[PDB]
Each structure stands twice: as structure tokens, then as C-alpha cells.
Amino acid sequence: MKTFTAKPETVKRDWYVVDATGKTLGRLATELARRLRGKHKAEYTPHVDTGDYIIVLNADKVAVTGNKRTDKVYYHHTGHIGGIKQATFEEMIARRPERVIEIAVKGMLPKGPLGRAMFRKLKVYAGNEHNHAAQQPQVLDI
Amino acid sequence: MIGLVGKKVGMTRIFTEDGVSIPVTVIEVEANRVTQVKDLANDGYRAIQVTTGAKKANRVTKPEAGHFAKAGVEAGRGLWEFRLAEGEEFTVGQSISVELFADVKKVDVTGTSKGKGFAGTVKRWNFRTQDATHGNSLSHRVPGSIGQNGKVFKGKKMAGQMGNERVTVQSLDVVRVDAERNLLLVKGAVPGATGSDLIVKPAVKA
Amino acid sequence: XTXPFXX
RNA sequence: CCCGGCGAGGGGAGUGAAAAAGAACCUGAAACCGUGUACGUACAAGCAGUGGGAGCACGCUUAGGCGUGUGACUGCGUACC
RNA sequence: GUGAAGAGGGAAACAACCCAGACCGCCAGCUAAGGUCCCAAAGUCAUGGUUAAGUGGGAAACGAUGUGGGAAGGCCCAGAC
RNA sequence: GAUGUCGGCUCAUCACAUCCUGGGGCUGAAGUAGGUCCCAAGGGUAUGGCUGUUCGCCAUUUAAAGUGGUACGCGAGCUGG
RNA sequence: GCUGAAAGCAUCUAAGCACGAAACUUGCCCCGAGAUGAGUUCUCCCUGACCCUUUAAGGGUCCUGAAGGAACGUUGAAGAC
Numbered sequence: 225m226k227t228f229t230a231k232p233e234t235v236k237r238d239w240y241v242v243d244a245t246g247k248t249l250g251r252l253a254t255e256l257a258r259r260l261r262g263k264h265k266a267e268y269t270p271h272v273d274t275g276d277y278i279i280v281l282n283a284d285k286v287a288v289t290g291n292k293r294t295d296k297v298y299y300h301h302t303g304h305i306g307g308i309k310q311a312t313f314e315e316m317i318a319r320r321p322e323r324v325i326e327i328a329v330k331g332m333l334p335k336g337p338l339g340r341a342m343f344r345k346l347k348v349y350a351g352n353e354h355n356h357a358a359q360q361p362q363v364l365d366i
Numbered sequence: 367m368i369g370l371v372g373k374k375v376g377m378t379r380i381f382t383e384d385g386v387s388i389p390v391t392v393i394e395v396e397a398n399r400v401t402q403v404k405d406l407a408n409d410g411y412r413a414i415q416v417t418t419g420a421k422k423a424n425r426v427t428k429p430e431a432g433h434f435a436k437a438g439v440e441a442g443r444g445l446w447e448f449r450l451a452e453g454e455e456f457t458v459g460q461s462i463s464v465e466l467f468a469d470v471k472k473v474d475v476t477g478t479s480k481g482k483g484f485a486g487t488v489k490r491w492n493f494r495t496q497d498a499t500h501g502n503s504l505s506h507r508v509p510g511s512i513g514q515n516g517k518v519f520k521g522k523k524m525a526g527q528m529g530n531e532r533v534t535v536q537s538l539d540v541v542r543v544d545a546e547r548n549l550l551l552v553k554g555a556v557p558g559a560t561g562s563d564l565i566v567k568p569a570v571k572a
Numbered sequence: 573x574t575x576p577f578x579x
Numbered sequence: 580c581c582c583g584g585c586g587a588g589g590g591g592a593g594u595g596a597a598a599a600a601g602a603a604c605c606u607g608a609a610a611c612c613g614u615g616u617a618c619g620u621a622c623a624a625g626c627a628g629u630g631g632g633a634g635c636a637c638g639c640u641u642a643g644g645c646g647u648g649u650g651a652c653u654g655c656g657u658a659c660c
Numbered sequence: 661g662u663g664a665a666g667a668g669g670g671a672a673a674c675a676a677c678c679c680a681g682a683c684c685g686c687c688a689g690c691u692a693a694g695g696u697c698c699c700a701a702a703g704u705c706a707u708g709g710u711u712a713a714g715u716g717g718g719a720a721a722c723g724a725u726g727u728g729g730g731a732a733g734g735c736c737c738a739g740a741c
Numbered sequence: 742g743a744u745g746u747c748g749g750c751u752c753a754u755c756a757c758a759u760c761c762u763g764g765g766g767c768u769g770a771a772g773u774a775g776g777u778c779c780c781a782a783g784g785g786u787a788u789g790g791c792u793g794u795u796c797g798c799c800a801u802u803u804a805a806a807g808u809g810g811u812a813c814g815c816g817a818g819c820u821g822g
Numbered sequence: 823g824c825u826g827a828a829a830g831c832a833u834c835u836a837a838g839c840a841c842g843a844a845a846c847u848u849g850c851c852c853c854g855a856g857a858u859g860a861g862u863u864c865u866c867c868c869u870g871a872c873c874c875u876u877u878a879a880g881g882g883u884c885c886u887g888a889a890g891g892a893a894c895g896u897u898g899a900a901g902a903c
């Protein structure tokens with residue numbers, strides 16, 4: 225018979241909460257994408273979103289090795305001739321620390337309507353507070 | 367601190383005692399009234415909401431009627447906002463006069479510029495006109511090249527709408543303040559045509 | 573033939 | 580007989596085996612242009628398909644869970660001579 | 661020797677390089693090159709070491725108490741440097 | 742079985758091996774004024790005479806009158822010496 | 823540059839700490855919630871009767887039609903439309 229394939233109309237999606245303080249950037253976000261994609265579920269399906277919502281707190285306390293806190297550059301363009309603007313790891317945390325994890329995931333996820341839908345299941349907060357407890361979230365020691 | 371809303375009445379000449387002519391841009395700053403006083407507990411920034419002028423009864427909308435009736439203040443001709451510098455306090459229904467600019471000596475006016483409509487590169491970007499004779503073929507007041515040997519870079523200076531946009535002139539010397547007439551004599555020229563509404567705020571550039 | 577097109 | 584400009588062009592009646600033969604006439608393909616219905620489609624990037632495949636609609640089905648059409652999302656994929 | 665006249669897998673993409681010679685079909689498995697955190701199928705695997713430069717992931721003469729390791733030597737409780 | 746060539750005009754744009762302005766080290770830097778080297782590309786960066794000229798010489802200025810890439814930038818934008 | 827070991831001294835550095843340019847981030851000005859992550863505040867308007875039906879975010883009928891908008895018109899120091 226045809227191999228099992230998940231259906232997004234009747235698939236379950238759970239909620240979880242995380243604290244990245246002290247965690248390494250890549251070794252941490254690597255596990256995020258693995259979960260928002262559904263590779264940790266038995267009903268895994270590449271063309272379906274079988275992932276679990278996540279709420280990571282304390283994004284302004286990630287851990288990094290070497291001088292990446294100063295040497296790691298975050299280039300990007302605006303669509304102009306000068307365009308190119310650079311920002312070190314420190315300049316981002318102080319101004320917008322959420323984008324650090326939001327960007328690391330963007331590079332670990334597929335490129336398409338699906339990979340962008342996984343991101344939507346990702347919620348980051350620079351502090352330790354949130355207004356998502358109404359969803360009955362759970363803990364995750366990753 | 368905060369500014370005010372007025373009308374551009376025109377320009378005239380002011381003769382001093384030494385025989386000097388100071389250009390001025392008279393402004394009819396009618397008595398302003400506050401409509402809302404917002405804080406951080408609800409909105410998230412210390413500012414106010416001020417209107418002025420008047421409006422017809424059977425022409426203003428009901429939504430705004432309650433918005434103005436809430437503060438017991440007669441309707442105006444519009445609505446504006448001013449941020450507070452951590453040391454300003456006001457209350458709804460409070461009327462503000464032109465005397466607020468009594469001891470400032472400088473302001474930065476703001477208003478919409480005149481409407482030139484579809485303009486060319488010369489009228490707009492001060493482009494250099496090509497030769498009018500000596501071979502020119504239908505290319506007198508044209509731009510010329512717009513690139514290289516394969517896309518036109520963004521922001522390329524081209525023809526288009528010129529004017530009818532927000533414009534802010536800075537550091538204009540004040541000359542006189544007549545509260546009896548609700549006027550303000552600002553030195554120099556300001557954007558907008560006669561009758562247009564314009565903002566007047568103290569100068570931050572000193 | 574005459575130089576540039578088609579002088 | 581009727582609409583219409585005592586028009587063109589049409590609609591009934593009528594002839595005839597045929598008017599879905601109106602002489603712009605046997606048969607009447609395709610490109611091309613349209614009306615109607617089902618499905619899909621306005622956060623989505625590239626030879627426009629292929630493999631897999633959710634959902635929707637209809638017909639089956641003695642509910643048999645198959646087939647037809649649509650094809651969200653997804654891997655690979657740069658026409659022919 | 662391959663290509664031309666040879667697809668397939670890998671080298672990010674890349675006729676000539678590496679692996680390997682497509683009769684057709686299956687939603688069976690073991691392997692080669694090459695790889696095994698994520699995009700992206702498979703070890704955040706095991707032991708003992710090295711590097712701190714993101715070197716790795718572009719490069720010489722030449723310079724340098726970088727750093728680990730290896731065999732000696734000179735001078736050292738006659739007091740050395 | 743067509744990729745139109747110098748220069749000028751116009752409109753520009755990036756690189757930094759910096760012309761000026763900015764920040765410094767040594768100076769056979771007294772001072773003023775220079776020389777040399779380092780960091781720095783934010784903005785700015787001559788007009789005319791002769792010549793088709795780019796270039797170059799000359800005159801007079803300027804804080805300085807930068808070096809180069811862009812089909813020796815730019816003819817479906819002009820010119821055609 | 824201060825302090826200061828490694829290396830009894832010395833050293834701007836390895837840990838720590840203080841200066842430092844028209845670059846970069848800011849502050850000045852304009853666009854700006856299609857920021858599909860599609861935001862936030864205030865105020866205003868609608869408080870029907872049933873049927874049937876794959877009984878559902880279902881369909882249809884009668885009554886009801888506000889807030890407001892648009893259209894039209896007279897026009898603009900707004901404007902190609």
C-alpha cells in the first residue's frame with residue numbers, strides 16, 4: 225500500500241518553551257529547525273508542517289565561542305547601489321537580539337512557502353516574560 | 367517643547383527704526399485646543415493631540431463628533447500630534463495661545479510644498495541642458511544617459527511629481543508675537559501657499 | 573554601404 | 580405575422596428526408612476569439628513539466644475507500660533543430 | 661583514458677576530472693566515489709593528540725621570546741640568569 | 742544569417758594604491774612651511790587659448806583641480822570634428 | 823596609555839581599565855503597518871420572522887438598509903488620466 229503521508233488538516237502540533245541563556249547559537253538553533261520541520265515526529269512528511277510551536281526566552285543571553293561576539297558580521301542589502309550595511313554580533317543584541325535566532329533558523333530551514341510557514345511557528349522574546357501561557361505551553365531542556 | 371498649528375496668511379515687509387526691511391511670513395495661529403492626552407500605560411509614548419479652526423455642523427462625521435465631544439471641545443479642521451520632552455503636562459479642553467513662543471527666539475516650521483505636477487529633470491534636479499543647436503536632434507532638454515553597457519540603479523534622478531510633499535524649514539528667527547491678533551511674524555519664507563495649514567515648533571538646532 | 577547605417 | 584429606419588440583420592410560421600440548407604448554403608477539422616460550469620489562484624520567484632501528494636466537486640459505488648477533472652505544498656529539472 | 665557517440669551518482673552549480681557502463685518494470689536490499697549537526701538521506705559516534713588564527717575556507721621570499729613535541733649542549737645551593 | 746569604433750556633450754556609478762579637508766607615528770620636525778609612512782572613500786575635486794583630439798604645453802585660479810573600473814561607462818540618449 | 827604578570831627586571835595586554843577621526847551606529851529632514859511578522863489608541867453604527875436542507879463557519883425567502891462611503895455636481899495656489 226502507499227506509504228503513509230501526513231495531512232495538515234488533522235495533524236497535531238504542540239507548544240513548548242525554551243531558555244537559550246548560556247546556549248551556543250548553532251548547536252541550539254540546529255535543534256529548533258529539526259523540530260519546527262517535524263523530523264522528530266514519526267509522522268514526518270517533507271511537504272507538510274508536522275512541527276511543534278516553540279517559545280524561546282532570553283534571546284539576549286546566547287553563548288558564543290571565540291571573538292564571534294565582535295568579529296561575526298551580519299551583512300545585508302537594501303536594493304540600492306551602496307546598499308550593503310554591516311553589523312557585528314554585539315551591535316545586533318543591543319539593538320535587536322531577536323533577529324539573531326530568527327536569522328540562524330532562516331538558514332537552516334528549507335527555502336519555500338513551507339520553510340517560511342515553519343518560521344511562523346517560532347516565537348522569540350528577549351526577556352523571560354510572554355503572554356502565551358494561555359496556550360498551555362510546556363518545557364524543553366534543549 | 368511642543369509646537370502649534372496655524373495658517374499661512376502671506377508675506378509682508380517689516381520696517382525697523384534703523385530703516386531695515388525684515389521679510390516676514392505672517393501666520394494666523396488660532397487658539398489651539400487639546401483633544402487627547404496619551405501616556406505609556408495605554409499607548410506607549412508621551413504626546414498630545416491638538417486641533418484648531420472650526421468646521422460645519424452638518425459636514426463633520428459622527429465618529430469625530432464623539433472624539434471631540436468626549437473632551438468637550440468644539441470641532442476643528444484637523445488633528446495633529448506633538449511628543450512631550452519628559453517634562454510637559456497638559457489636560458483635555460486646555461486652550462493654548464500664541465504666547466507659548468514668547469521666549470524661544472527661533473522655530474522650525476513645517477508644511478506641504480506647492481504643487482508643480484509632473485516635472486522634468488531640469489526643473490526637478492537642476493540638470494544641465496544640452497546644446498540647443500549645432501546638431502542636436504530632439505534632445506535639447508532630455509536627461510541623456512541613464513546607465514552603462516544592464517539596469518537603472520534605484521534612486522536614479524528622473525522626471526516625476528515635484529512638490530506637494532512634507533517640507534520642514536529650520537531655524538527661522540521670530541520677529542513679533544501679537545496675541546491680541548493671534549499672529550506670529552516668522553522671518554523668511556515657509557512652505558505652502560496662502561491658506562494652507564503648517565506646523566510651528568521650537569528650534570532644536572538652536 | 574556608405575558608412576554608418578545607412579549614409 | 581412581429582422588432583427594426585416602408586433598413587440591414589433576426590424571431591415564428593411554412594416547404595422539404597435535412598432551415599443545425601437563409602443562396603455568406605454538402606461534409607465543416609486546427610490555429611485563433613468567446614459564453615457557461617467545477618476546481619485552483621492576489622507572501623509568492625525561473626523551459627511551466629515530472630514523481631509523490633493534501634483538500635474540493637461529480638459519477639460509480641448494493642457506503643467498498645476506485646476512476647474522472649482540478650493540483651495548495653514538496654524533491655529533481657536551463658526548450659527543439 | 662574519458663568526451664565526441666555515454667546517460668546515472670559525486671565535485672555547490674561545472675561535455676573532457678573521481679566512481680560507475682542505463683534492455684523494461686517494482687514504494688526490495690547490500691555497496692563505490694563521496695559523505696554522515698541543519699537546508700539535505702546517514703555518527704552532535706569511540707580513543708588519544710594538535711590548532712585559537714573562523715586558521716580551516718586563496719598565496720611566496722622574509723620576519724617573529726606564537727605554540728606543542730624531540731635529541732643534546734653551556735652555565736647552576738662553590739649561589740647561577 | 743551584423744556585438745556600431747576615438748573625442749566631445751549629457752547622466753552618472755563603484756574601488757582606494759588619498760588630490761584637498763579629518764586623525765596620527767618618525768622627521769637631518771625650532772617656528773612657519775615641507776618630507777616620509779600609517780588609518781580613513783563622508784563629502785568635495787577649475788575655467789579658458791591652440792589642436793578633431795584623449796593627452797600635452799601655455800595663461801589665470803582653487804583648500805585641492807586625485808588615480809582607476811564600468812564594451813579604453815554611456816550613438817534604440819545627442820553629436821559626427 | 824595607566825596597572826601588570828607570563829619571563830623576580832622590562833613591557834599598552836594575556837585577565838582588567840582609560841583616551842582616540844569628516845568613516846560605521848546615533849542624533850537633523852522625508853517616505854514609512856502589503857512591517858502577509860500585515861501593529862497600537864480614541865470615537866461612531868447594526869440588538870429581525872421563519873422555512874428548508876449532504877445539518878454545516880451551510881443555503882434561500884420576507885422585513886430591515888444605519889455609521890459611513892461612492893457616484894453626480896460647482897471647483898481648487900491639486901492635477902497628464
Ligand SMILES: C=CC[C@@H]1/C=C/C(=O)NC/C=C/C(C)=C/[C@@H](O)C[C@@H](F)Cc2nc(co2)C(=O)N2CCC[C@@H]2C(=O)O[C@@H]1C(C)C
Pocket residue numbers: 573574575743744745746
Ligand atoms: C567603407 C567603409 C569602412 C569599412 C566598413 C565595413 C563594413 O562592412 N561595415 C559595416 C559594419 C558592421 C558592424 C558594425 C558589425 C557589428 O555587428 C560587429 C562590429 F561591431 C565588430 C567590429 N567592427 C569593427 C571592429 O569590430 C570595425 O572596424 N568597424 C565597424 C564600423 C566600421 C568599421 C569597419 O569595418 O570599417 C571598414 C574600414 C576599416 C575599411
